[PDB]
Motif scaffolding. Structure first.
Motif, mmCIF file in Angstrom:
data_model
loop_
_atom_site.group_PDB
_atom_site.id
_atom_site.type_symbol
_atom_site.label_atom_id
_atom_site.label_comp_id
_atom_site.label_asym_id
_atom_site.label_seq_id
_atom_site.Cartn_x
_atom_site.Cartn_y
_atom_site.Cartn_z
ATOM 1 N N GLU A 1 0.828 -1.174 0.000
ATOM 2 C CA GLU A 1 0.000 0.000 0.000
ATOM 3 C C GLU A 1 0.881 1.249 0.000
ATOM 4 O O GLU A 1 1.865 1.311 0.699
ATOM 5 C CB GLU A 1 -1.022 0.002 1.163
ATOM 6 C CG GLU A 1 -1.632 1.392 1.397
ATOM 7 C CD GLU A 1 -2.742 1.461 2.395
ATOM 8 O OE1 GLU A 1 -3.576 0.566 2.420
ATOM 9 O OE2 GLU A 1 -2.765 2.445 3.135
ATOM 10 N N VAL A 2 0.529 2.215 -0.852
ATOM 11 C CA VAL A 2 1.156 3.511 -0.904
ATOM 12 C C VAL A 2 0.121 4.631 -0.878
ATOM 13 O O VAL A 2 -0.867 4.619 -1.631
ATOM 14 C CB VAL A 2 2.037 3.692 -2.148
ATOM 15 C CG1 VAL A 2 2.716 5.027 -2.082
ATOM 16 C CG2 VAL A 2 3.088 2.644 -2.159
ATOM 17 N N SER A 3 0.298 5.595 0.024
ATOM 18 C CA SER A 3 -0.725 6.624 0.191
ATOM 19 C C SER A 3 -0.097 7.982 0.395
ATOM 20 O O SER A 3 0.996 8.068 0.905
ATOM 21 C CB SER A 3 -1.755 6.307 1.263
ATOM 22 O OG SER A 3 -1.501 6.872 2.480
ATOM 23 N N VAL A 4 -0.764 9.011 -0.134
ATOM 24 C CA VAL A 4 -0.383 10.363 0.050
ATOM 25 C C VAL A 4 -1.614 11.120 0.503
ATOM 26 O O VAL A 4 -2.734 10.854 0.050
ATOM 27 C CB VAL A 4 0.252 10.995 -1.176
ATOM 28 C CG1 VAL A 4 1.572 10.326 -1.522
ATOM 29 C CG2 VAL A 4 -0.641 11.006 -2.381
ATOM 30 N N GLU A 5 -1.402 12.044 1.418
ATOM 31 C CA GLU A 5 -2.439 12.897 1.926
ATOM 32 C C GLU A 5 -1.990 14.326 2.050
ATOM 33 O O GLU A 5 -0.794 14.588 2.232
ATOM 34 C CB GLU A 5 -2.833 12.458 3.329
ATOM 35 C CG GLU A 5 -3.529 11.148 3.409
ATOM 36 C CD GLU A 5 -3.850 10.800 4.880
ATOM 37 O OE1 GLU A 5 -4.950 10.258 5.127
ATOM 38 O OE2 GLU A 5 -3.044 11.126 5.797
ATOM 39 N N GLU A 6 -2.936 15.256 1.954
ATOM 40 C CA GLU A 6 -2.688 16.609 2.318
ATOM 41 C C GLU A 6 -4.006 17.219 2.773
ATOM 42 O O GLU A 6 -4.953 17.373 1.954
ATOM 43 C CB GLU A 6 -2.065 17.397 1.171
ATOM 44 C CG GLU A 6 -1.686 18.832 1.558
ATOM 45 C CD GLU A 6 -0.959 19.651 0.469
ATOM 46 O OE1 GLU A 6 -0.732 19.098 -0.630
ATOM 47 O OE2 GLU A 6 -0.624 20.855 0.724
ATOM 48 N N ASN B 1 -0.161 13.101 -9.023
ATOM 49 C CA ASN B 1 1.241 13.109 -9.363
ATOM 50 C C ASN B 1 2.139 12.857 -8.105
ATOM 51 O O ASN B 1 3.104 12.148 -8.215
ATOM 52 C CB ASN B 1 1.698 14.375 -10.109
ATOM 53 C CG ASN B 1 3.011 14.117 -10.869
ATOM 54 O OD1 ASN B 1 4.041 14.603 -10.475
ATOM 55 N ND2 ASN B 1 2.966 13.296 -11.944
ATOM 56 N N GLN B 2 1.786 13.404 -6.933
ATOM 57 C CA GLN B 2 2.562 13.086 -5.734
ATOM 58 C C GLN B 2 2.544 11.573 -5.396
ATOM 59 O O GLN B 2 3.571 11.002 -4.977
ATOM 60 C CB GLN B 2 2.145 13.957 -4.572
ATOM 61 C CG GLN B 2 2.587 15.380 -4.866
ATOM 62 C CD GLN B 2 2.161 16.377 -3.814
ATOM 63 O OE1 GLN B 2 2.018 16.035 -2.603
ATOM 64 N NE2 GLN B 2 2.062 17.661 -4.229
ATOM 65 N N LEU B 3 1.363 10.952 -5.575
ATOM 66 C CA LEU B 3 1.210 9.514 -5.378
ATOM 67 C C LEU B 3 2.141 8.730 -6.303
ATOM 68 O O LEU B 3 2.842 7.813 -5.822
ATOM 69 C CB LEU B 3 -0.257 9.127 -5.540
ATOM 70 C CG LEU B 3 -0.509 7.626 -5.375
ATOM 71 C CD1 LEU B 3 -0.152 7.195 -3.968
ATOM 72 C CD2 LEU B 3 -1.942 7.240 -5.810
ATOM 73 N N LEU B 4 2.224 9.119 -7.610
ATOM 74 C CA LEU B 4 3.131 8.481 -8.539
ATOM 75 C C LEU B 4 4.554 8.634 -8.121
ATOM 76 O O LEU B 4 5.305 7.669 -8.173
ATOM 77 C CB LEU B 4 3.006 8.969 -9.986
ATOM 78 C CG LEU B 4 1.647 8.917 -10.709
ATOM 79 C CD1 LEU B 4 1.761 9.020 -12.225
ATOM 80 C CD2 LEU B 4 0.994 7.602 -10.364
#
Ligand SMILES: CC(C)(N)[C@H](N[C@@H]1CCc2cc(C#Cc3ccc(Cn4ccnc4CO)cc3)ccc21)C(=O)NO
Ligand SMILES: [Cl-]
Ligand SMILES: [Zn+2]
Ligand SMILES: [Zn+2]
Length: 300
Positions: free
Chosen positions: A135-140, A269-272
């Motif tokens: 799992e890979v995740s980005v949040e803001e 794009n940050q997730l990539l």
């Protein structure tokens, strides 16, 4: 038989206008060799400038997804990329006569039609997939974009507009491409904008090509487009469409699940970028026997 790479069978041409620039532009799709990927080129410039459609080449993501190479840009790639991904096109040259991909009707429908009119060509090389392993995740703030391991390809999205046109809609959708067609259920979903955001762009000399002919325009109470929606959930389906296109900047089709929550081109794009850097979270795989595969493609 393996799952093979795909390119276009013939050259095809389209014309339209840049959503942001308002400039008329000619687009030319051409076949390409194995392991080329999707490459944009500005054939109006001398020398001609090529920009591979890869995450490393993304510049600005505030309104749309832009590709950059020095001072040369290609604006608004995401809906064309969504169509390439949805049809499984590995290799193509996308020539543009100006700095922006034509908006067409605001969806990926005209592109999916154009590509399939040209027809597809299977190539003698194994198609490479990027498989999500962890799992890979980005949040803001309250926005989140996630990849989850999954033997298939599935995209879920949730929007949350505190707005009269969206209250009491679920504002959520999930598409699993094992059962469901990108063409029939996602491709026609048009872009959209709220009136105050549109006016802001126009004040900044942007969105100069936009109109009810290529976007769903929502005023404070109502859709302004007199002829209505293409899908009950066209807004959230367009978000899925954008995600598919933004995801394709990885340069290979994905085996996994994407989940977005109030996310857009910047977090996509940050997730990539986070995915790419976390090499433990993914692997490149091929399928020597298509029957063992979690994804299949329509006939060429
Ligand atoms: C992620 C999304 C859904 N936020 C994004 N939305 C795109 C972004 C820029 C834009 C601009 C417009 C317009 C527009 C527009 C501009 C002018 C008029 C008409 N007009 C002309 C003068 N004043 C007005 C205001 O009524 C109508 C629409 C529509 C859609 C979009 C996306 O899909 N990215 O992939
Ligand atoms: Cl975002
Ligand atoms: Zn205006
Ligand atoms: Zn879009």
């Amino acid at each position: 038989s393996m799952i093979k790479q795909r390119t276009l069978k013939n050259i095809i041409r389209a014309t339209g206008v840049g959503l942001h620039s308002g400039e008329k532009v000619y687009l030319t799709l051409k076949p390409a060799p194995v392991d080329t990927g999707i490459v944009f080129s500005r054939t109006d410039l001398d020398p001609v400038v090529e920009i591979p459609a890869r995450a490393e080449n993304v510049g600005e993501t505030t309104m749309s997804t832009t590709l950059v190479k020095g001072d040369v840009k290609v604006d608004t790639v995401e809906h064309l990329l969504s169509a390439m991904a949805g049809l499984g096109i590995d290799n193509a040259y996308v020539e543009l006569s100006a700095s922006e991909v034509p908006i067409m009707d605001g969806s990926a429908g005209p592109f999916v039609f154009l590509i399939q009119s040209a027809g597809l060509q299977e190539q003698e090389a194994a198609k490479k997939f990027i498989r999500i392993k962890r799992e890979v995740s980005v949040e803001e703030g309250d926005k989140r974009a996630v990849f989850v391991p999954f033997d298939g390809f599935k995209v879920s999205f949730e929007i949350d507009f505190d707005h009269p046109v969206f209250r009491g809609r679920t504002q959520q959708a999930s598409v699993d491409f094992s059962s469901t067609s990108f063409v029939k259920e996602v491709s026609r979903a048009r872009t959209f904008g709220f009136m105050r955001d549109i006016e802001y762009l126009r004040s900044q000399n942007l969105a100069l090509g936009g109109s009810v002919e290529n976007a769903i325009v929502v005023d404070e109470n109502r859709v302004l487009n007199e002829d209505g929606l293409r899908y009950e959930d066209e807004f959230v389906k367009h978000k899925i469409l954008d995600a598919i296109g933004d995801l394709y900047l990885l340069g290979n089709s994905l085996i996994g699940e994407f989940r977005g929550f109030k996310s857009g081109h910047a977090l996509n794009n940050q997730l990539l970028r986070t995915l790419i850097a976390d090499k433990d979270a993914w692997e490149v795989v091929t399928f020597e026997d298509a029957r063992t595969a979690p994804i299949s493609y329509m006939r060429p």
